[PDB]
Amino acid sequence: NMMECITVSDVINVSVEEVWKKISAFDEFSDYHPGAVRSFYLHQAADQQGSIRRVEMSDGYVEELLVNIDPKNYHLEYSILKSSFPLDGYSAEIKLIPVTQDNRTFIQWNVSFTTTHPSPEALVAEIKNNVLIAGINGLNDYFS
Numbered sequence: 001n002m003m004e005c006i007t008v009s010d011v012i013n014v015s016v017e018e019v020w021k022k023i024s025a026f027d028e029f030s031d032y033h034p035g036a037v038r039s040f041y042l043h044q045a046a047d048q049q050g051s052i053r054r055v056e057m058s059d060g061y062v063e064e065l066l067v068n069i070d071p072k073n074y075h076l077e078y079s080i081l082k083s084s085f086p087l088d089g090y091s092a093e094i095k096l097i098p099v100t101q102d103n104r105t106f107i108q109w110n111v112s113f114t115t116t117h118p119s120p121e122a123l124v125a126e127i128k129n130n131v132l133i134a135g136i137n138g139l140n141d142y143f144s
């Protein structure tokens, strides 16, 4: 019943334009996330907003809706429509801010959800380390 909330932020050594280009490509999630086997569009929108992707991982699957995107502010919000995981009301958020010195990128990844999992502290630690931290480090390895 309690609303979980995770916030992970780091600095990737790559320009903000190149980070946004890969992140705004909604279906290319599996290219840089090591836990995602495949990722593709179920339905794609011309204005990006409203696109639905499917991310297949080693545990289960996930189908997410792109609820809002703002290229001028490097802001991106998406939520889970269907999932084989005990994630109810899941919503995620990505915010990029340029780092002028050496032209890097400040990434901030926030998620919020409610779960019926009996051990939620282990579930929030699983998402924080193996989804958010692993995804940021994966984006850093993708641009190596």
Ligand SMILES: [Cl-]
Pocket: 091, 092, 093, 110, 111, 112
């Ligand atoms: Cl959020």
Ligand SMILES: [K+]
Pocket: 030, 031, 032, 033, 034, 035, 036, 037
């Ligand atoms: K992968």
